[PDB]
Structure 1
Amino acid sequence: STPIQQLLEHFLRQLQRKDPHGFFAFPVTDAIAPGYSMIIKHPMDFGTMKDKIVANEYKSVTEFKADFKLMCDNAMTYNRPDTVYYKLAKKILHAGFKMMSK
């Protein structure tokens, strides 16, 4: 793998450690989350991001950060603010961006 893929795998491992319950591990389905496909146009999750790094589909850290922000944004759009899901989305979005920008 390329030096960029190795960097992105490093960031992904540290970001997924912020979600020990695995809520962002795999794609949401409308069985789990009624109406999700009517609300969310562009789903994202950590498993999809890992497959994209392995396939060498990210040109830059910028494109990788955009998928991580899309994931967190979708969770804050679908889930209400008082839920575990919206609170973790907001927490990890900000912590994960500061981690990747240091």
Structure 2
Amino acid sequence: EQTPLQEALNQLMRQLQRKDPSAFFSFPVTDFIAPGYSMIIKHPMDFSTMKEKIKNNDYQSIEELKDNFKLMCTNAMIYNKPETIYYKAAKKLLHSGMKILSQERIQSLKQSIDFMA
């Protein structure tokens, strides 16, 4: 059984992943797919890793998941040049995810989570 915070994080994750229908961010980036990635990107992140962190009750707050989501998108904007499909998709996903992870949602969920304690 999961905590209200875990369930809230999973609901947000489901909406975030629907904004990545091409699965650009589903799985960790490998060096054979992205040569030098592990030397360039100091803190890799992907949706599957975020999902495991929710399951393992690693997140203390929605803001921590939001930071991880931003990190995943900006990593792709560092490794890929601005003209590329992957940079443009990362920037668009970042923009869409910031609406999904809005302060108004976070504030609403904080109250509900607190009330259910």
**TM-score where L is the length of structure 1:** 0.96
Question: How much has 1:95 moved relative to structure 2?
Answer: 1.4
Question: How much has 1:58 moved relative to structure 2?
Answer: 0.3
Question: How much has 1:92 moved relative to structure 2?
Answer: 1.1
Runs of 4+ residues over 2 Å off in structure 1: none
Tell me what 1:14 maps to: 15
Amino acid at match of 2:86: Y
Distance 1:72 1:25 in 2: 12
- Structure 2 residues not aligned, in runs of 5+: 105-117
1:14-49 CA distance string (max 9 Å, x none): 001000011100000110001111100110000000
State how many pairs are aligned: 102
If you compute each CA radius of gyration, which structure gives the higher value, 1 or 2?
2
- Structure 1 residues not aligned, in runs of 5+: none
Superposed CA RMSD:
0.8
Q: 2:77 aligned with 1:79, yes or no?
A: no
Matches within 5 A, 1:1-102: 1-101=2-102, 102=104
**TM-score where L is the length of structure 2:** 0.84
Between the aligned residues of both structures, percent identity stands at 66
Question: How much has 1:97 moved relative to structure 2?
Answer: 1.0
Distance 1:45 1:100 in 2: 16
SS of residue in 2 equivalent to 1:90: helix
